Design goal:
It is globular and about 60 Å long. The termini are far apart. A hairpin with a 5-residue loop joins strand 8 and strand 9. The chain contains 9 helices and 12 strands. The chain folds into 2 domains: 1-89, 2-Layer Sandwich (Phosphorylase Kinase, domain 1), CATH 3.30.200; 90-261, Transferase(Phosphotransferase), domain 1, CATH 1.10.510.10. The longest helix is centred in the middle third of the chain and has 20 residues, at 96-115. With 261 residues, it is α+β, with helices and mostly antiparallel strands. Bound molecules: the ligand Cc1cc2n[nH]c(=O)n2c2ccc(-c3cccc(O)c3)cc12. Belongs to the protein kinase superfamily. CAMK Ser/Thr protein kinase family. NIM1 subfamily. It catalyses: L-seryl-[protein] + ATP = O-phospho-L-seryl-[protein] + ADP + H(+); L-threonyl-[protein] + ATP = O-phospho-L-threonyl-[protein] + ADP + H(+). The active site is at residue 122.
């Protein structure tokens, strides 16, 4: 918007994606900050619709949108704590208590989304932002979709996620349940938080690092950097068969999950 840019300074780019970028906008008079996602016409049509459904403390707030020619402008909560990735020291991760707290907040967000029949489909640290009190905020619903209509689930079939975070059934099954896919990527996020590295390029047979995990070689990186209490949870999350994979209600029963640190 031309009138918007007259009163709001587009200060800097917060991030760049495939079909555009997110910018920090600051009102010159009030100094209010908002994030402006600019998309040259990710599924932007469904993104807006899904964003309109969301209302939760661990999801990036959606203020509104408008079209200006062929460009779509989405107005989002500015998360001034930045990205989760920037709390992860490469090859080291972060303190276990910090990882635990973020993971609880991630579960809170995912439980909310799943409760209203929405799957994010691209959970990774780049899409987990932080507010000014370091509260985790799930971000970017460009790949999200509805997997439950009222109380009626449907299987999904789309392989749109970032490969290191994708569940193995996406490489093996034509159709699959939404919830265990998101649970899997949450486990990859937890691994990154605790070890500062991703375990594999992809969870395929042909990927050696995935084979090593399947064969319980937890004396190798990244696993050897992870305490056995949180590793025990990862053992239940990063289960190949999505039908045998831990569900979020059972994650809430895990010893490490509930361990005071
Ligand atoms: C840093 C940041 C703050 C923010 N506040 N509100 C928002 O939508 N964002 C963001 C939205 C997106 C991204 C982004 C984008 C691409 C890659 C990547 O790694 C990060 C960062 C932010």
């Amino acid at each position: 918007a031309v009138p918007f840019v007259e009163d709001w300074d587009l200060v800097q780019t917060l991030g760049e994606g495939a079909y555009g970028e997110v910018q920090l906008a600051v009102n010159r008079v009030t100094e209010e900050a908002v994030a402006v996602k600019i998309v040259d016409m990710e599924n932007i049509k469904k993104e807006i619709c899904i964003n309109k459904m969301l209302n939760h403390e661990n999801v990036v707030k959606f203020y509104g949108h408008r079209r200006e020619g062929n460009i779509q402008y989405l107005f989002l909560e500015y998360c001034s704590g930045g990205e989760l990735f920037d709390r992860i020291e490469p090859d080291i991760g972060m303190p276990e208590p910090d990882a635990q707290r973020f993971f609880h907040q991630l579960m809170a967000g995912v439980v909310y989304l799943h409760g209203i029949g929405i799957t994010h489909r691209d959970i990774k640290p780049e899409n987990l932002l932080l507010d000014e009190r370091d509260n985790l905020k799930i971000s970017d619903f460009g790949l999200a979709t509805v997997f439950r209509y009222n109380n009626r689930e449907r299987l999904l079939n789309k392989m749109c996620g970032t490969l290191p975070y994708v569940a193995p059934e996406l490489l093996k099954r034509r159709e699959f349940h939404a919830e265990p896919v998101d649970v899997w990527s949450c486990g990859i996020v937890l691994t990154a938080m605790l070890a500062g590295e991703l375990p594999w390029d992809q969870p395929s047979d042909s990927c050696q690092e995935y084979s090593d995990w399947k064969e319980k070689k937890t004396y190798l990186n990244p696993w050897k950097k992870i305490d056995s209490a949180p590793l025990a949870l990862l053992h239940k999350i990063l289960v190949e068969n999505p039908s045998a994979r831990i569900t979020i209600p059972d994650i809430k029963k895990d010893r490490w999950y509930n361990k005071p640190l």
